[PDB]
Amino acid sequence: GPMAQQSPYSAAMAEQRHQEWLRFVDLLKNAYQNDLHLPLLNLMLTPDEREALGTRVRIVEELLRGEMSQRELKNELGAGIATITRGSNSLKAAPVELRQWLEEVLLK
Amino acid sequence: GPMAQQSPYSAAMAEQRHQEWLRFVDLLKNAYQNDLHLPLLNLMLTPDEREALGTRVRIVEELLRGEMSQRELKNELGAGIATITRGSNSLKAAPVELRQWLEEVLLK
């Protein structure tokens, strides 16, 4: 039995809600071009919904600075041990004349 | 006593929510220009909030066609009696030779 994936009612109401969302995105796009975006957003949204969107922008900003500041901390800490291992390896491969000279001038 | 119109806390939180709304409107404006509006709207809104905006566009459309269709009905009905009164006035001001001729050809 090849069962139908969805009903004809759900398929029609899915395309309807799809076209209604596209009409809104297109309506808001031309509003930004016709400089009517600010009054249109007041018609589409309540004052509380506008405050919610303004705070969500600050939420995703503080979430990005939270991930980025620790991403730079994970890279700065990881690169910190990289210069130490490079310093240890380059010190072993250094010639004897340079090594014994560094022990004399750096360690008095 | 010249009472202060609002508190310093309410004035600061009013400018904050004002700048957060402007940042959102500007963020969405550049998204439409950088062709990133569709993924940004999915980040800012839930699927239910997107369905709500898509239906509100159809609401304001059906509210406009409701007002417009009856506006045209109020104008078509008002202009209908205007042609009747013009027909009555123009018929009284018509000459006798035209009036008695219309009674002969239109009323057999």
Numbering used by the authors:
A (entry chain AA), B (entry chain AA): 22 to 129
Task: Pull verbatim passages from the article behind this deposition.
In the course of this work, crystals were also obtained and a structure was solved for Val58Ile ds-TrpR with a 23-residue N-terminal extension including a His6 purification segment, a spacer segment and a protease-cleavage sequence. The uncleaved protein is expected to include the initiating fMet residue, as inferred from mass spectrometry of similar N-terminally extended proteins (unpublished observations). This Val58Ile TrpR protein with intact N-terminal extension is hereafter referred to as uncleaved. In the wild-type ds-TrpR structure previously deposited by Lawson et al. the first modeled residue is Ala2, although the protein contains fMet as the first N-terminal residue due to its incomplete removal in vivo from the overproduced protein. Indeed, the presence of the apparently disordered N-terminal extension does not reduce the resolution of the overall structure compared with the extension-free structure. The crystallizability of ds-TrpR with a flexible extension accessible in the solvent channels suggests the N-terminus as another locus for the attachment of groups that might orient guest proteins within the channels.
Tryptophan repressor (TrpR) was one of the earliest gene-regulatory proteins for which a high-resolution crystal structure was determined in complex with its DNA regulatory site. Formation of the extended domain-swapped structure depends on the conversion of two interhelical turns in each subunit of native dimeric TrpR into helical segments, resulting in the formation of a continuous, nearly straight α-helix of 47 residues.
